[PDB]
Structure formats: C-alpha cells, structure tokens
Amino acid sequence: EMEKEFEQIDKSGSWAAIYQDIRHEASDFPSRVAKLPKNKNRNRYRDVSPFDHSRIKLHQEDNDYINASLIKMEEAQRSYILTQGPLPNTVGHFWEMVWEQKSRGVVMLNRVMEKGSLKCAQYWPQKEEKEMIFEDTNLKLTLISEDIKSYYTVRQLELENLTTQETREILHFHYTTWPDFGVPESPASFLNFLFKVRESGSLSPEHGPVVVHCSAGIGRSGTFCLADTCLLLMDKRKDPSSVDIKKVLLEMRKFRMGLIQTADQLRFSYLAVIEGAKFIM
Ligand SMILES: c1csc(-c2ncc[nH]2)c1
C-alpha cells in the first residue's frame, strides 16, 4: 500500500531519489515534427515537445502542428490531451483542436500572470458581449456564464464553427489558487476541483478527450491526470492496493515527456491519491 510507502519516503526524506529514478526510467521517443524550423514559434519552451507518435494533428493541410499530446490510459478507459498554454499566435489553433477532437472540457491549472510574467495568452472572452473571432481558424467563442468560487472558476462557453454554423458548449474549469511557488499544503481543494470536472461529464467517453494545460502542460497538468487515473483504477480493480502511482506515471510518460516536474509535485500526487482514496472507500 502507497500510504505506508508515503511514510517511508517521507520519514527517510527520499522524494528527490524516487523522482530521479523515474527521470532515469522514463521513455524517450522522437519529436522531429516539434523541432522543424517552421514550428519554432508554435512552441513556448524549446525543451518541451510532443513525441511524434502521440502528437495531436490539426486538420489544416498547411501546417498540422500543435504542441499537444494524446495520453491514452487503456485499463482506466480514460484519455486526456495535454497541451501548453496557448501563445498569442496559437489561440486559433488551440480552439481548432478543441473543435476537431470533440472535447467537452478545458482544464486550466495556471493564472495568466504568475511571478510577474505571462504564462499563457488570454484565450477566452472576459465579458458576455465581447465575443472573440479567430480569423485564422474560422471559429467564434462567446462567454455564456461564469461561476467564480474561492478555489476555482467554471465558465460556460459557446464555440461556433463559422464555416458550418454548428455550435458546441465548452466548459472551462480554471483552478485559480495553485501557489506561484511549490504545491498546495492540502490537496482538499484540488480533489474538490477534480470531482467537479468529473461531475460535468467532461472526462466521460461520450465526449472527446478533455484538454488539460498549465504553462508547459507537464507539471500541474500531470498531477491532474495522474490523480484522476489512479483513483479510477482503485474503483476498477479487485485489489485497490495493486495500484502503483510510479508505474502509472511511467505509462503516462510514454505519451508526453516530463509529466510531474518536481519531487514536490510527486509527493503532492501521492497525497492527492491517498486523500481521494478515503472519499472513494
Ligand atoms: C513566451 C514564450 S514564447 C512567447 C511568444 N511567442 C510569440 C509571441 N510571444 C511568449
């Protein structure tokens, strides 16, 4: 059981050691499309790239590239798209991908500004009456409603395909209280946030994969997906304690590099799963 393994690593203070072994054991696959010169300005960080095998392709004939990865968890019957914070230039591309993958939810784990820098373009409208048009990708985005709470905000958006006049409701789940440095003290509000996303049906197989992003789409994003998947496998399996979070993390890392950036995020993920297991059992 992971609870006892938690105390072990914690009492021994071995988090940097565990984390380093995971770094060592992680998959490395080609990312040739990410590195093409024509895609240089479609990437926020030069050392964060989608693998070619799991990358999301845009259905535009010109350049199909976006910094985004499909993570398929076969046993848990869960899929996620992990992507970077859109850039000023890639906001049209981001919404094109939401449209093409038939996603119902966007999950954002960063503020637009953190540490006095921009982590992310402002990619949704701030007022009902000021909708956004993406001329490059022929989409229109309207804020329908906005429910602001202590730890997070939920926004209903309408996405319209200007080409075909089809519309879809997209839910934007925005966790607004992740601290600028380190990880939250308690996983309580993060679990609450995870339960709210699940309840929306955005993680459900009747929809395309949820889109999850922070700035790089690997650190906080990773914690989101790792916690969701581990909790789901604890429901599914005959023996819930068969679930090894290190194994699950290594299976997710086949799909996107660098998921969980720090030993702190690793520890927080254990704590999120351990605490969420109580509510589930
Ligand atoms: C941060 C990293 S790259 C970037 C950017 N790309 C295009 C405009 N601003 C902002």
Buried b (16+ CB within 10 A) or exposed e, 73-111: beebebbbbbbbbbbeebbbbbbbbbbebebbbbbbbbb
Distance (Å, whole) CA 15 – CA 242: 21
Among 143, 187, 194, 204, residue whose Cα is nearest residue 173: 194
**Structural tokens at position 45:** 């960080």
Determine the straight-line distance between the first and last CA of the chain, rounded to whole angstroms.
14
Decide whether any atom of ligand 1 lies within 6 Å of the 48 Cβ.
no
Helix (H) or strand (E) holding 273: helix 263-280
**DSSP assignment string, 184-197:** -S-SHHHHHHHHHH
Decide whether any atom of ligand 1 lies within 6 Å of the 88 Cβ.
yes
214 labelled catalytic:
yes
Q: How far is the CA of 160 from the centre of ligand 1 (A)?
A: 27
Distance (Å, whole) CA 122 – CA 205: 29
The crossing angle, in degrees rounded to 10, of helices 263-280 and 245-252 is 120
Method: X-ray
Decide whether any atom of ligand 1 lies within 6 Å of the 87 Cβ.
yes
Q: Which of 120, 214, 225, 230 is catalytic?
A: 214
Q: What is the arrangement of strands in the sheet containing 55-57, beginning at the earlier edge strand?
A: 55-57, 65-73, 78-83, 210-213, 105-108, 167-175, 152-161, 139-148, 132-134
**Structural tokens at position 31:** 């990312």
Determine which residue's CA is closest to atom 1 belonging to ligand 1. 44
Burial of 150 (0-12, 13-18, 19+ CB in 10 A): exposed
**Structural tokens at position 146:** 């906005």
Helix (H) or strand (E) holding 57: strand 55-57
Q: How far is the CA of 86 from the centre of ligand 1 (A)?
A: 9
C-alpha pair distances (Å), 73 with each of 175, 230, 255: 24, 10, 10
Distance (Å, whole) CA 223 – CA 18: 16
**Structural tokens at position 176:** 């607004």
Classify 19 as helix, strand or coil. helix
Q: How far is the CA of 139 from the centre of ligand 1 (A)?
A: 22
Determine which residue's CA is closest to atom 2 belonging to ligand 1. 44
Distance (Å, whole) CA 90 – CA 123: 9
Read off the amino acid at residue 228.
D
181 phi, psi to nearest 5 deg: -120, 140
Q: Is 219 annotated to bind ligand?
A: yes
Are 271 and 187 in contact by the 8 Å Cβ rule? The answer is yes
Decide whether any atom of ligand 1 lies within 6 Å of the 216 Cβ.
no
Among 17, 34, 9, 6, residue whose Cα is nearest residue 257: 34
Distance (Å, whole) CA 49 – CA 32: 9
Decide whether any atom of ligand 1 lies within 6 Å of the 89 Cβ.
yes
Task: Enter the resolution in angstroms.
Answer: 2.2
Are 202 and 171 in contact by the 8 Å Cβ rule? The answer is yes
Q: How far is the CA of 104 from the centre of ligand 1 (A)?
A: 27
Distance (Å, whole) CA 130 – CA 47: 36
Decide whether any atom of ligand 1 lies within 6 Å of the 20 Cβ.
no
Among 146, 143, 144, 206, residue whose Cα is nearest residue 173: 146
